Amino acid sequence: DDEEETYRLWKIRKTIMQLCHDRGYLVTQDELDQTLEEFKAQFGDKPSEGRPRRTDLTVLVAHNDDPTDQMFVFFPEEPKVGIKTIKVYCQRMQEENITRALIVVQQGMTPSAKQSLVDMAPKYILEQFLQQELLINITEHELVPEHVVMTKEEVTELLARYKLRENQLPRIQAGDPVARYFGIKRGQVVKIIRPSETAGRYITYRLVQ
Amino acid sequence: QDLGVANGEDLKETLTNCTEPLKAIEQFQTENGVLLPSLQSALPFLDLHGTPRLEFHQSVFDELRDKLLERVSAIASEGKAEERYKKLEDLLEKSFSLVKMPSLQPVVMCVMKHLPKVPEKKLKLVMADKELYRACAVEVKRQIWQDNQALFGDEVSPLLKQYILEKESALFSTELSVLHNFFSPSPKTRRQGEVVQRLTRMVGKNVKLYDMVLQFLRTLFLRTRNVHYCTLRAELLMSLHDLDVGEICTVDPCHKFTWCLDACIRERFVDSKRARELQGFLDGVKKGQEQVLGDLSMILCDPFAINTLALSTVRHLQELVGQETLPRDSPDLLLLLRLLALGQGAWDMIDSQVFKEPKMEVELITRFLPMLMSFLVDDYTFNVDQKLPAEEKAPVSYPNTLPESFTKFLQEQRMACEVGLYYVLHITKQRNKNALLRLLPGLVETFGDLAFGDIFLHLLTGNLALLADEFALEDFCSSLFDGFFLTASPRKENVHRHALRLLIHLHPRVAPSKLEALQKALEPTGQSGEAVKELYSQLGEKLEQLDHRK
Amino acid sequence: MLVIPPGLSEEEEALQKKFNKLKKKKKALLALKKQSS
Numbered sequence: 001d002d003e004e005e006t007y008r009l010w011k012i013r014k015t016i017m018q019l020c021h022d023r024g025y026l027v028t029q030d031e032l033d034q035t036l037e038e039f040k041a042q043f044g045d046k047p048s049e050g051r052p053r054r055t056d057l058t059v060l061v062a063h064n065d066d067p068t069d070q071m072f073v074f075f076p077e078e079p080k081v082g083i084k085t086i087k088v089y090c091q092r093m094q095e096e097n098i099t100r101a102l103i104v105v106q107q108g109m110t111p112s113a114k115q116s117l118v119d120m121a122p123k124y125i126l127e128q129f130l131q132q133e134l135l136i137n138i139t140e141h142e143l144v145p146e147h148v149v150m151t152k153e154e155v156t157e158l159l160a161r162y163k164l165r166e167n168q169l170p171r172i173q174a175g176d177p178v179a180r181y182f183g184i185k186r187g188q189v190v191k192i193i194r195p196s197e198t199a200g201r202y203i204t205y206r207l208v209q
Numbered sequence: 210q211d212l213g214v215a216n217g218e219d220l221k222e223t224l225t226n227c228t229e230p231l232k233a234i235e236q237f238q239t240e241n242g243v244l245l246p247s248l249q250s251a252l253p254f255l256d257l258h259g260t261p262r263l264e265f266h267q268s269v270f271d272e273l274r275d276k277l278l279e280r281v282s283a284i285a286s287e288g289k290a291e292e293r294y295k296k297l298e299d300l301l302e303k304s305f306s307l308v309k310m311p312s313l314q315p316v317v318m319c320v321m322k323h324l325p326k327v328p329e330k331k332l333k334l335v336m337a338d339k340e341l342y343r344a345c346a347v348e349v350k351r352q353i354w355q356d357n358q359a360l361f362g363d364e365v366s367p368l369l370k371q372y373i374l375e376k377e378s379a380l381f382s383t384e385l386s387v388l389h390n391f392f393s394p395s396p397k398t399r400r401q402g403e404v405v406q407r408l409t410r411m412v413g414k415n416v417k418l419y420d421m422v423l424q425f426l427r428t429l430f431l432r433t434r435n436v437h438y439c440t441l442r443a444e445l446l447m448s449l450h451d452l453d454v455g456e457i458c459t460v461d462p463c464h465k466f467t468w469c470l471d472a473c474i475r476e477r478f479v480d481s482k483r484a485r486e487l488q489g490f491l492d493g494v495k496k497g498q499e500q501v502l503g504d505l506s507m508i509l510c511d512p513f514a515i516n517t518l519a520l521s522t523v524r525h526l527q528e529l530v531g532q533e534t535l536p537r538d539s540p541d542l543l544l545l546l547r548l549l550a551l552g553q554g555a556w557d558m559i560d561s562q563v564f565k566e567p568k569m570e571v572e573l574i575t576r577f578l579p580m581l582m583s584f585l586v587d588d589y590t591f592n593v594d595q596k597l598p599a600e601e602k603a604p605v606s607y608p609n610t611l612p613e614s615f616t617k618f619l620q621e622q623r624m625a626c627e628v629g630l631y632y633v634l635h636i637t638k639q640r641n642k643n644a645l646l647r648l649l650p651g652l653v654e655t656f657g658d659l660a661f662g663d664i665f666l667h668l669l670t671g672n673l674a675l676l677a678d679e680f681a682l683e684d685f686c687s688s689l690f691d692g693f694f695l696t697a698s699p700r701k702e703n704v705h706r707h708a709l710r711l712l713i714h715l716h717p718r719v720a721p722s723k724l725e726a727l728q729k730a731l732e733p734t735g736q737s738g739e740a741v742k743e744l745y746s747q748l749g750e751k752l753e754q755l756d757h758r759k
Numbered sequence: 760m761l762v763i764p765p766g767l768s769e770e771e772e773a774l775q776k777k778f779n780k781l782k783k784k785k786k787a788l789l790a791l792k793k794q795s796s
Binding site: 026042044051094097 | 387589
């Protein structure tokens, strides 16, 4: 199909825009929520060997403050990504001076490339997402409360007020889909605001482990 | 006391005279009152009221006037065109004698507003009266302007001057920001400016007025050499496009080209598909319609179009470096260069009336561009060498020598100068201080002093704000200021203003000795303009505040 | 008609030589990093 492909690409684009905005980046307001027809007009309405193919819509976004760091998003052509395919993206990144980036894989990544992604973590950070992960913004789900990443100063304030250590906070997985959505690293407290039927509002905290 | 009208003049007399004839006065009201028998029986109730008989009649008159205005609008909206226009013409013929009556003037003005063609005698009478002309709606003013080019020019020239002043002031904003610069606003946002909206409202659907505005823009572009007139041409055409004015968009040969270029400007990049669409628009110019090429070059002379095309050219050069390919073998790069050549040669093409595409110099493609690619190549190898393990680190010094041929290309070729200036902006945005210092001496002498233009200097200062920590080094500040800014500031006031803005923004990070030296070197003279003195005073205030923070 | 010259300029040949040297250096460095990874 071709209309299904452009709908899927538009939904992935919308979810990536919302992900960048929730992550704290410069997302243009009309780009943040554009019509499917607007996407088809801007890109070509034929993903099947046509104008809105992959690598055309690699979204480059900067940070809201400190506009240096960017994570210009990647869309591989092939379903199953490999090392010799991600090394081209590594070449494009080392051509630049920016270390973060997101790749949107179609099928599963080869596990050797999964190890390779970790094999450059101190140098430059790479996150990967499957198509099914980006067809729905899970933060819009009613079961998912408001996750907010906390700054280090706020973490110090929290630990000093409650007189507890980072070892004592209830924790959260690094492979958590919400944690992957915000792209938080290990040791980064996330405040969670959720409505409670007994107190109104409850703010919990989840250190990342 | 006009046609069948009793005292306005003898009304002033009636207010001055004051002796006695009561029955004459009463007969005058009876003859010149609301001549309805049904009102004669109702008047004693008003007499039985107590409030003087002026507010009631004024309220009734205002309500009748408003109902008449509503009915004029309804007639203009409903029915067959010929019948409604004939009714409006009859009403105008009956009511035009009261055009100077303030209470009934709105009715006449509305009737004239809804008429497709007002009679020429009434239009001349309105033109002869300044207040009547001012009170007229833009629809009547269009019928006046279409046959009076001088009056339309008098109405339009202040707007054009205001547009130029607004663009220049935007170039000299106090805030230095890479994120919020002259090219930050989207085209749709730019078309919302007061001048563009007012010009679009004045033109409306009148093709003749649009052609007059285009002629004014061409004449001012030739006379003043200001490219923001080209910007205004593009924005006015696209503003008419946003209002679905098909009477103008269908006859303008640049409409589709300007639309595609507007999309490219919005995306800040020209892809292969959009490039091919623009090429198809260019190659579609038929023999005998070559003046359309001059118009298209004027569209391409827009600073936004030039910025988008040059940034796309630099990005394509980087991609060619990545792909191990030569500039001559890339059709998209050649197409971008062709568009840039047309944009740069717009002024010469319009002035000489020779509507032919400028010949792109061979040495540009075959020599200058691959040398820029070699600069990129040196940057990449230096960056890779700096990341090698310490056991393999040879003492690699960054290449600081600028080839003489590169400087000659910047001095003698306009296109090479433009591409090199945008490459300098690109490397400065990447915080590559070594490449910036390598290329800076070649910017002192450039083609037509393009390196000292306000657009380039605005972008350059904005990007230099990203290198704020490097201003603590005396060598970096000496290079930048002494070798580039101070070489031209005594001869160019705009360079002085840009240097003052940069210093005002970055004074907390400049070395104190160099800061004092720059404050002395940038001191305004007796011949300096008011803006330079104001910027210098602001710098002094900031320095005093910084000293107080010790 | 855009007249494209039928030969590389001396500058273009020098830049092709520089680019080939860079390709060789980059390949050597990639081999080095593979040995160090």
